[PDB]
């Protein structure tokens, strides 16, 4: 039972520019095995409007996936992602960077 | 100039919980366009893209019955796996599934791969040949002389050669502007201080397609390698691709660094600096 | 190899019926089938493991089959209807999607109402013509089994212990004695050849084994006689010089 | 569904046989051919996954998708072919479904006829006499007769291993005492060159 | 189009 480290990417879409209309994507990639646990979270408050990609793995044979929603941003909320596999001890901290 | 189409297959063993976990996913370079779930509602190979929606029903339910006979097969698999690690039935396993075929500038059949991994680990693979096998594992043997009785790897070869490549033109061409388009990145660069001694300079390519490209960073003329992070390429969601490097730059030296920028879809390599 | 259990099986309507298939040692798929005179292969249910993927294309609910106590596998059909007379096939393959797929000999199944007509084949050698041997300058023998039913018949040709292969004939098809009538008998037709001399020789035992089937210990009877049951009417001849 | 004609074929000893089969779902992969004896088990001989020209010494099955057809070529028939052939298409993805088949008839070279009507004699069991129709030639047809209660057999073909002999057959007897020999084939188109003994 | 003959190990 080979188990791998999921590193994790949040990002938006277009240009983040606030006014325009964009989107929040929460890439994980390069885990073992797929049992994974992944929410998007607005401050806290879980955001329940977000559809997982299909599950397919990679040529390392570790599995990655796509979770995304339709969001705009102002400069005052924050949003963040949750993931917890089977390898952390905890789960995991990825605030939205604007300029990353 | 090549093209590939592939197919990927998931079986996640689940003690207790009834039935193993099948997913089924197929995939035109990096585009997506059958996927599977012994989960979901509807139990029938979904579309996604407009080409494959144009495909009619007596291929659909053709690939229902074929692909929950797929997933019988992975499911029998499990439990081979558990009997020749000698493992215990409770437990979470993974077995995985990749098969596909590549076509080249012209359009005809180049290289070929079907290949087994388990619970992460490597199993058996195709060579490039088609003609012998990759046994990866100890005991992992005993499946690849079975699989030369039936003369397995002889019968995939005519697969990955036949209907593989006749159908991939097929597809290309039910929606050629769709596959066959290819986008080049909406380069720039961006400044971050993480001091008033420390600041990174990131270089930026928006929205591109396909998914390889070459981002590396230059420091006078010389390959810049110590000071760099990059991430994998990440998929955007309307069929693109994002990628960023970035270098940590003493504050001051700017201009020394100039970006480089590789990709089959533009004309020569693009150079990045700092405004 | 393979084997289907048993040789075969002649019941009264209504009767339920368990079908065995020994099918090949290792080998993780089994596929059922049913075929007759006019019909052609006909599907039934697919197996894989001990689940079964597809149950769709089975006549009645009377029929179910199940194979989940190992690898040997049942075919059950209950209340037999006189509609389901047919040779059933079972064939088994190491893989599911491998080349060869191996049938065992196969069980034909006669479903009757009335047992009114289980007769035993009269069986008779017929002698060779001297005018053969003395034309031809070979000897033939004929082996004929008037009034049976029903087409349940393995002939068999017996030289002195050992049944040869060599010159022998058995028509596929008997023939009904009577048109479009009820409930018919049957009469199929044989024959054996050999050298001339070979027959002329009287230290030949030559032999015709008819394997019948009739009833088993699972229907009593007493209507005429006693309880015609699977039996075997054997003609028996000797060589002969004058 | 997967339809093919079911003859059946008529081929005389060493000339070419040839079977034929189509199917629907154009994106077939799966051909088969079982050759099944009289009701005994099907028997797998030929197979065929790609397109093109494969050889086991005597068969030759082709496919071709472009049709959407597959075939069978027996080189050098022997009489010891006659049996129904038949075509499979993996359906789904694991299932082998069947056309009715094609039965086939190898008429055997009758290299030296000799058409004869032999009497059976009265071996002590029942007053019927056998009489029987040999040696006959491949173009000969055996219809039944004048009283069709009185019964005829159907052709057949018989071996001789280490003599290296071939003949045909038929027979006809009756219950009555009443049916000789001469008057037996009376349907049955006889050469001129008929031994016909009378006991 | 998916892959029409299947192998255990």
């Given at each position: 039972m080979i188990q791998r480290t999921p590193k994790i990417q949040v990002y938006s879409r277009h240009?983040?520019?606030?006014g325009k209309s964009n989107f929040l994507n929460c890439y994980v990639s390069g885990f073992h095995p797929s049992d994974i646990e992944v929410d998007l979270l607005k401050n806290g408050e879980r955001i329940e409007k977000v559809e997982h990609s299909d599950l397919s793995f990679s040529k390392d044979w570790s599995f990655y996936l796509l979770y995304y929603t339709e969001f705009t941003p102002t400069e005052k909320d924050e949003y963040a992602c949750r993931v917890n596999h089977v390898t952390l001890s905890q789960p995991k901290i990825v605030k939205w960077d604007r300029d990353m | 100039g090549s093209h590939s189409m592939r197919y990927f297959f998931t079986s996640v063993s689940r003690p207790g919980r009834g039935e193993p976990r099948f997913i089924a996913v197929g995939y035109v370079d990096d585009t997506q366009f059958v996927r599977f779930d012994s989960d979901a509602a509807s139990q029938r190979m979904e579309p996604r893209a407009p080409w494959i929606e144009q495909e009619g029903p007596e291929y659909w339910d053709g690939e229902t019955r074929k692909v929950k006979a797929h997933s019988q097969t992975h499911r029998v698999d499990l439990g081979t796996l558990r009997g020749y690690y000698n493992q215990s039935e409770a437990g979470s396993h993974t077995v995985q599934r990749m098969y596909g075929c590549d076509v080249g500038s012209d359009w005809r059949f180049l290289r070929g791969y079907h290949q087994y991994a388990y619970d992460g680990k490597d199993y058996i693979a195709l060579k490039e040949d088609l003609r012998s096998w990759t046994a990866a594992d100890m005991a992992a043997q005993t499946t690849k002389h079975k699989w030369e009785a039936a003369h397995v790897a002889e019968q995939l070869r005519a697969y990955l050669e036949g209907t593989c490549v006749e159908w991939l033109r097929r597809y290309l061409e039910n929606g050629k502007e769709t596959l066959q388009r290819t986008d080049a990145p909406k380069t720039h660069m961006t400044h971050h201080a993480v001091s008033d001694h420390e600041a990174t300079l990131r270089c930026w390519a928006l929205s591109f397609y396909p998914a390889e490209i070459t981002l590396t960073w230059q420091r006078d003329g010389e390959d810049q390698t110590q000071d760099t992070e990059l991430v994998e390429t990440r998929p955007a969601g309307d069929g693109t691709f994002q990628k960023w490097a970035a270098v940590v730059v003493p504050s001051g030296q700017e201009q020394r660094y100039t970006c480089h920028v590789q990709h089959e879809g533009l004309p020569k390599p693009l150079t990045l600096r700092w405004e | 190899g393979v084997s289907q259990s048993p040789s075969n099986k002649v019941t009264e309507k209504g009767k339920d019926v368990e079908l065995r298939c020994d099918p090949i040692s290792g080998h993780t798929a089994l596929y059922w089938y049913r075929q007759s005179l006019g019909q052609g292969l006909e599907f039934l249910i697919y197996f894989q493991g001990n689940s079964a993927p597809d149950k769709s294309?089975?006549?009645?609910?009377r029929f179910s089959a199940e194979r989940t106590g190992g690898s040997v596998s049942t075919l059950t059909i209950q209340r037999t209807q006189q509609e389901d007379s047919a040779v059933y096939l079972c064939a088994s393959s190491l893989?599911?999607?491998?080349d060869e797929q191996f049938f065992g000999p196969g069980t034909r199944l006669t479903v009757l109402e009335?047992?009114?007509?289980?007769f035993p084949p009269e069986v008779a050698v017929f002698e060779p013509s001297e005018a053969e041997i003395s034309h031809t300058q070979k000897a033939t023998l004929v082996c004929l089994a008037t009034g049976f039913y029903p087409d349940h018949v393995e002939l068999s040709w017996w030289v002195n212990g050992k049944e040869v292969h060599s010159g022998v004939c058995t028509d596929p098809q008997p023939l009904k004695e009577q048109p479009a009538l009820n409930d018919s008998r049957y009469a199929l037709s044989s024959r054996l050849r050999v050298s001339a001399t070979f027959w002329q020789n009287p230290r030949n035992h030559f032999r015709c084994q008819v394997q019948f089937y009739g009833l088993s210990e699972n229907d009593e009877w007493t209507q005429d006689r006693a309880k015609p049951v699977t039996q075997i009417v054997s003609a028996e001849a000797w060589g002969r010089a004058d | 569904e997967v339809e093919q004609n079911s003859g059946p074929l008529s081929v005389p000893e060493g000339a070419i046989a040839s079977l034929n089969c189509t199917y629907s779902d154009r994106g077939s992969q799966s051909f088969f051919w079982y050759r099944q004896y009289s009701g005994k088990s099907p028997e797998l001989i030929m197979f065929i996954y790609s397109n093109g020209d494969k050889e086991d010494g005597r068969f030759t099955a082709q496919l071709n998708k472009a049709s959407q057809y597959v075939s069978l070529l027996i080189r050098d028939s022997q009489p010891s072919d006659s049996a129904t052939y038949l075509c499979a298409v993996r359906e789904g993805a694991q299932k082998l479904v069947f056309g009715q088949g094609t039965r086939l008839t190898i008429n055997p070279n009758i290299q030296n006829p000799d058409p004869a009507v032999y009497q059976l004699r009265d071996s002590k069991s029942s007053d019927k006499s056998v009489c029987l129709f040999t040696?006959?030639?491949?173009?000969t047809n055996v219809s039944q007769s004048k009283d069709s209660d009185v019964y005829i057999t159907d052709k057949c073909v018989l071996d001789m291993r280490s003599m290296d002999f071939k003949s045909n057959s038929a027979v006809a007897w009756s219950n009555k005492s009443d049916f000789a020999c001469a008057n037996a084939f009376n349907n049955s188109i006889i050469p001129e060159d008929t031994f016909f003994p009378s006991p | 189009l998916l892959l029409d003959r299947l192998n255990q190990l």
């Open positions: 240009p983040a520019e606030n | - | 294309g089975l006549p009645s609910d893989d599911l999607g491998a009335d047992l009114k007509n289980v | 040696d006959f030639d491949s173009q | -």
